From Swiss-Prot, chains A, B:
The modification N6-acetyllysine is found at K122, K136. The modification N-acetylalanine is found at A1. GO terms for cellular component: axon cytoplasm; cytoplasm; cytoplasmic vesicle; cytosol; dendrite cytoplasm; dense core granule; extracellular exosome; extracellular region. Changing G93A: In ALS1; increases tendency to form fibrillar aggregates; ubiquitinated by RNF19A; ubiquitinated by MARCHF5. The ditryptophan cross-link at Trp-32 is responsible for the non-disulfide-linked homodimerization. Such modification might only occur in extreme conditions and additional experimental evidence is required. Palmitoylation helps nuclear targeting and decreases catalytic activity. Cu cation binds at H46, H48, H63, H120. This is Superoxide dismutase [Cu-Zn]. The gene is SOD1. It is linked to Amyotrophic lateral sclerosis 1: A neurodegenerative disorder affecting upper motor neurons in the brain and lower motor neurons in the brain stem and spinal cord, resulting in fatal paralysis. Sensory abnormalities are absent. The pathologic hallmarks of the disease include pallor of the corticospinal tract due to loss of motor neurons, presence of ubiquitin-positive inclusions within surviving motor neurons, and deposition of pathologic aggregates. The etiology of amyotrophic lateral sclerosis is likely to be multifactorial, involving both genetic and environmental factors. Spastic tetraplegia and axial hypotonia, progressive: An autosomal recessive, neurologic disorder characterized by loss of motor abilities in the first year of life, after which severe, progressive spastic tetraparesis develops. Affected individuals have severe axial hypotonia, hyperekplexia, hypertonia, and myokymia, reflecting upper motor neuron involvement. Cognitive development may be affected. Belongs to the Cu-Zn superoxide dismutase family. PANTHER family: SUPEROXIDE DISMUTASE CU-ZN -RELATED.
Length: 153, 153
């Protein structure tokens, strides 16, 4: 019913659009959209603490632990509330994503409205890769585009 | 006592970052922050209805007229219930923003919490200078970085 709007912008050809389709205000959300200006294969994809992403990296570090676990989800079980999978792109420069989930809803100033999403440079491990750091971020690499989430209904 | 953090990007190294603080939910508010990557001189800046700003015009056009008004304010008697005037940048490529207003506040999805903003690479004409487009947008002459409004509380 109520669609939210996440607008990620990097640099020229780099963007990330995601709509969040929610039917009331605390129930589960159907999520989809296109992250373009990528190279083919997987790219890490996380909802951070806050909507600050303006002091560059001096803002969103790794992805928020509000439930007190590691990075994960599409292969790991524990998973941050700040993790909506990874965006796997084609050679036409785009990852067009499709998801449905019951760990967030369009609720207040702290859920996924007023919040930040990050898209990463490379593929995400989603748990414990080959190193310590992979438990923090997924080892997904640097960030390109950044964006904030507001209401589109 | 909720502080915001909007993130505009897209025109490569151009960003538009604006903050706010809410002293009481119904009072006036000081906006602050910086728009950087700009040439020196004036640049128009507008909050719109919704946080909807993904691809461009299909995700919102001009700054909405809920009272069915013209644009303007700092030289005009109208002003939309969701717009501001213009900024100016110094030759480091940056506009300082440190402005007051007594009609926006951080309260509800349609206020500045939950909303969108775009800044413009030319001056704004505020309701009327020359043409139709003065009374419509604000004659703002060009786009630049666009974004959704974020919260750090
Ligand atoms: Zn994570
Ligand atoms: Zn206006």
């Amino acid at each position: 019913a109520t669609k939210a709007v996440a607008v990620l912008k990097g640099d020229g050809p780099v963007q990330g659009i995601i709509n969040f389709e929610q039917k009331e205000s605390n129930g589960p959300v159907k999520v989809w959209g296109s992250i373009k200006g990528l190279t083919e294969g997987l790219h890490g994809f996380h909802v951070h603490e806050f909507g600050d992403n303006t002091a560059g990296c001096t803002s969103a570090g790794p992805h928020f632990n509000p439930l007190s676990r590691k990075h994960g989800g599409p292969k790991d079980e524990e998973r941050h509330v700040g993790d909506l999978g990874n965006v796997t792109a084609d050679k036409d420069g785009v990852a067009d994503v499709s998801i449905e989930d019951s760990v967030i809803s369009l609720s207040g100033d702290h859920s996924i409205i007023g919040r930040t999403l990050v898209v990463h440079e490379k593929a995400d491990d989603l748990g414990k890769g080959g190193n310590e750091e992979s438990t923090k971020t997924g080892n997904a690499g640097s960030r390109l585009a950044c964006g904030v989430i507001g209401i589109a209904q």
